[PDB]
Amino acid sequence: VSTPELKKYMDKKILLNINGSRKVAGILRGYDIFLNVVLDDAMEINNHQLGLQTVIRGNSIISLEALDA
Amino acid sequence: AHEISQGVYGAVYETLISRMIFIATQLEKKIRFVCLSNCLANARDFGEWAGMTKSNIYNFSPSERIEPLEINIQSFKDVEHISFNFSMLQMAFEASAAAAGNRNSSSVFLPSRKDCMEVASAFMKFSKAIEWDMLNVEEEQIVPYIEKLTDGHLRAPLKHGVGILYKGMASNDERIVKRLYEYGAVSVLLISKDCSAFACKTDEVIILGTNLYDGAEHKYMPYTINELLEMVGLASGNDSMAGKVLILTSHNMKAYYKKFLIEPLPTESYLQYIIHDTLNNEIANSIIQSKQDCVDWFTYSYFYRRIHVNPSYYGVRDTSPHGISVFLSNLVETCLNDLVESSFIEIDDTTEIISTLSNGLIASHYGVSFFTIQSFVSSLSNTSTLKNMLYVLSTAVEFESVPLRKGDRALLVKLSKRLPLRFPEHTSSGSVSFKVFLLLQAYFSRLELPVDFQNDLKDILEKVVPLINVVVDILSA
């Protein structure tokens, strides 16, 4: 019920470490209470682009280092 | 006509006699009455009500009977809250074997099939260790008689000189059992209270338990003396100039039965209660159009001609030909002014008029209690569903004549698993209503009903057809 304080992380490119050796990155356009991150970039690891904006399920998102601190 | 006391299903009967009498003095008709009955203490009064003269009115003592009966009454501690105890059982056994060792044949009375079963095994146990466990007959003779085995629970008890009798066996089986007693084969017969009608004449009569459980009030009652009478009523055929009843009672109800088996049964009306329905019926038939018509009707009845003797029974403090009249008037007012609250009748000033509405009329036609009709009225409405209707039906007053034995609630609950519909949230689980609801389904869905419940179901079905008609044609109205 308590909203994740991700207004801090808004409009900054983030270097995620999602479930199962998957390093993806993208800007935080929108967030939510469930943690289904509505982000605006998708590229894999060297590098290659796959899909522009991407909404991920919050259950499979764990670690998220903001590139710009 | 002793049974015009017992409850109200009495007062019903009472009503009819009164009605007949009334008819006789409205058809100027030479109708004959033959009011056969028990010994009644008051009975001259009754006769006087029933259009008779002191000549024709033959009330006797119960000692005037002819196979003279020695009633032994036996009271026990800790019994008033149970059907029978172990001491009682022991006593019965002692008395049972006393008959079997002699040429005489005894029969035990009990509350229900479960009770009979309990007795049977216990009886067998008692026997095995003691000399007597004989059938007066070989072990290979009886098996030919009980080839059918339905119910199989009877077989094993029946096999060692101790038979069973409960309400609603396989008729053939019942017949066979009867034959086995009459013929002289089976030694002792266990009988459920409901089977008093099945008059197998015995010499000694054990009455194990003068106390009967009922979900009625969630408690043990007492065999109301009429029931008991059947066993004083059935006497010895073999040993002439001898009759015997062992009775297994509470200390409390010694003094009831010690009085009221050897003296005449006192006769009192229960009309007081039902008048609502009876009165309504009368109104519908339209002889009643006033608050004096009702009085007149009453005067042609046993209530009025009884009340003058014991009026404190019926709450008449004044007791004067004015006071009594006033009381009667009050009673009739009470009766009416429920029937105006419920949609039964209408009254206006000009001697002053009384007439039905559908609700009343339907009740009159189908013979369902004002109480029941009232109940029906409120719960049934526009857009009531089938389940709702069923529920309504199941809370008719009618079913107070339906036994709910020890552990029957549990059984019902267990059964509830296999039912199509489900009962409402806001009612009782101990009540007869619940039983009715499930035992309407019990035969809608062709289920395996226990033989106890079968009887209950049958009883319910005796009632339902008027009730269902009422339901349909209250909605129609």
């Binding site: - | 009612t427 689980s429 619940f434």
Partner: protein, 91 residues
Amino acid sequence: MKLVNFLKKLRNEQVTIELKNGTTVWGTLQSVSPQMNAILTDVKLTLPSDNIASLQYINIRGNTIRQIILPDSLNLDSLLVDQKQLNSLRR
């Protein structure tokens, strides 16, 4: 209603609960919670006969359990269908 209401009644019975990862643990149930949290006084172990790892008093997180067996061999069940009804006494 629920089958956790079944194990609610069984105070103080001996069980050897198969947990999901695989274990044999003889112990007294005591009181179980409506989230299946049982409390076990005496215990035998198996870390991943099977070797005794020398623990005595466990308290279970109700997520862990696969199969509970051998406290008692009975069949008695219902309760709430009785209680709702006998409280409807007066309106």
